[PDB]
Amino acid sequence: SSMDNQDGFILQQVKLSLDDPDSYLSSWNSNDASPCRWSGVSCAGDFSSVTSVDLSSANLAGPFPSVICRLSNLAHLSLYNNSINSTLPLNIAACKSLQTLDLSQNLLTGELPQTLADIPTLVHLDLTGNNFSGDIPASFGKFENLEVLSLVYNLLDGTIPPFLGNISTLKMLNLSYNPFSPSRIPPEFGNLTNLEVMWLTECHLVGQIPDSLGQLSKLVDLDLALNDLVGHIPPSLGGLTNVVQIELYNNSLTGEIPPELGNLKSLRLLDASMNQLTGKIPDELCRVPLESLNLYENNLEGELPASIALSPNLYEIRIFGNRLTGGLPKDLGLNSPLRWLDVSENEFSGDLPADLCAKGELEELLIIHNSFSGVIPESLADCRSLTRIRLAYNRFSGSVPTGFWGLPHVNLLELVNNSFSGEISKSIGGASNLSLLILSNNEFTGSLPEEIGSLDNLNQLSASGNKFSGSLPDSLMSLGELGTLDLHGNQFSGELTSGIKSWKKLNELNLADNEFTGKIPDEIGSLSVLNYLDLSGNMFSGKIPVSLQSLKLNQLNLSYNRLSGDLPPSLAKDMYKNSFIGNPGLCGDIKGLC
Amino acid sequence: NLEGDALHTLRVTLVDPNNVLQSWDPTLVNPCTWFHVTCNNENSVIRVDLGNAELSGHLVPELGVLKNLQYLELYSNNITGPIPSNLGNLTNLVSLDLYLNSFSGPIPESLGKLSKLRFLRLNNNSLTGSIPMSLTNITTLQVLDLSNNRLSGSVPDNGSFSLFTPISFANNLDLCGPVTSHPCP
């Protein structure tokens, strides 16, 4: 009789305490002798004693059921993703056998109960996604066996407590996304010898990174990101022997990347982006077989060490917004499954590495605003993995590889402000996912291929400042998803056709500084969304269509053409003063016109 | 950047059945590569072109952050709710085309602060209230259409409004003034 339990009665009392709109506790039959087969209830022991209760995602609403603490052998309680409300009761300490408490994603509010530390058996505390407020209780330094403390996405307004470094058993300290008083990282956090995870993102952290943090040999993840930390990356961080991930991004950190980070053999992911870091990227770090190296938007300078190409795990290199100089490693992409390369807004020079897409995984190639020279490596013609190509504002020359035009998954192709020559290949037809084509300010020649019309999902064609010639392909007018057509500053010739009616989604048409001849089609007014028209610097002839009156145009230039007759009266206003200059035949009620 | 964040905020409050805003990746440094967005040589937004997009929802005050914006084209949609006062913070705005929408509430007095505005088309909306006199202080104004609205009260006849015809103020609830048949109390 000493081993007899009232566990069924206790759980029935829990059920009464909480609201169960979606009837998740219907299995809980009062008539049932044992609660052991009830939903979410586990009796793992010899007797009919409840050991675990998981009521996660049951739409249960009400205050925490303190009656549950009368379950003597309860070691695991999860109320995850429920509507538990009100303060956490101090009588929760009565649950003296609890090893796991998950009250995450609930509506619990107020100060943290200090009595939580009075539960000696507690290993795991998750109070994430609640509205807990105030100071972390000082009792929390006296946790005897806790390995996990998660207070993420709560409303804690206190300073980060130094006494939390006194939990020797702690393996994870997760205090992220809390509105803490601006606080320095406690140096006593270096004494958490068994800690594997320190997650303090958006914890309003100020001050320097303590050198004590280097003593955390067992640490796997250091996230101190989205804080206002100042000072150098501590050289002592070479002592994080087991670290895999270091996140220090969007801080106010200054100084050089320490060469001692090369001593971190297990390191795969570093992000120290959006900092004021200066100096050169250390070779010793680059010798580490990294997966992701992101040092973007810093004041770093000097060559990117070639050791980075050696890594067999590298899929991500984002070092944009730096003053880095020299050439990209010759062997880059040869040994690694490269997916994302961003070296944009740097002073990099020389040929592109030949085999960036060697492993066939490259999705984004972004090298804009550098001094890269030579031709596009022919290997990239078979890089079907590519989705975004931004090679613009470089010193590239030569024809574009034939296959590069027709890469299937490319959405954006930007080759703007280079010296690229030759023609758009018929292979463009295979570019199914091409939406935006920007080839402006190059030395491109020839007619636009008919197969450009096969790209129905093309939204932008911008080829300004090129030597393109000939009549527009008839297929071009089949593109009804086209919103921008800018062919200004070319040698395009021929007439516009009635097919321009199909450009129902076109906002901008710029055909200026070309050798276009013929009459402006009367179908120009059928373009519903046309707000910008420039047909200036051409040999367009005839009367200006009356259809143009139907359009609400924020920009119009029909200047320097062969247009003749009288302006439609709507267009006779002072706003259209400079729109019709250089057309001799043309007379209207405008002070310069005739 | 700030401009991209502001436009993303707009995306979140708009209903986009045709996915015209799918290009609007907030993880991009600038919104310039986004479709329906045009930037200047300094990579600041100068144009947002989202007319006839079957867009529903409400505008956000965060559009005011786009200082270098010249053309805002949100016409021929079902966008509902008020015209944000912060649209007055768009100093370089040349065109405000919110026509053929279901916008309600007043025309903000802040729109007077749009010094360079040449086009104001708020026609075919459900806008109510009086026409702000501040709009007369916009010297650059050349096109105005407040027609097919539920506006009421005096129609200004001074400044930019001096040149404006009756077609601009047509089909409104109780517009009184010289441009209208009915003289004012």
């Binding site: 996304y177 996230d223 996140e247 982006s273 938007e297 | 993880t27």
Partner: peptide
């Protein structure tokens, strides 16, 4: 805002 711990994937 509440992203899990790991790099910031900002791109051009």
């Amino acid at each position: 805002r509440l992203v899990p711990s790991g790099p910031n994937p900002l791109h051009n």
